[PDB]
């Protein structure tokens, strides 16, 4: 066939129920992750492509980075309970893998401050129970799925991508590879 398990995606063993459509997994720690926001722009270019009807999740993980991993965790939580992913998510990016002036959850609040995000606002979000349970809820995802590399996205809590078996010679080429398998994915 022209998309076959095991080549453009792997199929999980052990299905998740109930699990987000799209769902995206990512590090800010993640040298990969940092080419597919900042160089492929692959969450975007996978949502253009993607029916009418469908959702797209992305989550943070904490097996990267230690200490400094899980605070970026719980700033994730806090970006979406704002709804600021589109503000932050680049110096974040850049905070961490390029200018490096990122190490302590003091510097990654700077960053919401810089973006405009309001002091007493992203305290009142970091301490807030419903981060917490946001927090849980990417924990809860990654674990489902026994999480053990980033970038990563799964399809309906079954199938999972596998950029591996696709060209890189040309980076929009395998940019729309990966967002029409996950769209042929989708439809499945």
Known sequence: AQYEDGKQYTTLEKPVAGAPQV????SFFCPHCYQFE???????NVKKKLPEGVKM???HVNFMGGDLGKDLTQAW?????????DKVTVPLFEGVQKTQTIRSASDIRDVFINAGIKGEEYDA????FVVKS?????????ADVQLRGV???FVNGKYQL?????????????????????????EK
Do not use: C, R
């Not at 939580?77 to 992913?85: R, S």
């Open 38 to 44: 900042e160089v492929l722009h692959i969450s975007d």
């Open 23 to 26: 769902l995206e997994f990512f």
């Open 57 to 59: 999740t992305k989550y």
């Open 162 to 186: 596998n950029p591996q078996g696709m060209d890189t010679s040309n980076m929009d080429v395998f940019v729309q590879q990966y967002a029409d398998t996950v769209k042929y994915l989708s």
């Open 77 to 85: 939580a806090v970006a979406m309970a704002l709804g600021v992913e």
């Open 125 to 128: 979000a970091w301490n807030s």
């Open 151 to 153: 970038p990563a996205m």
């Open 134 to 142: 946001l927090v849980a809820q990417q924990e809860k995802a990654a």
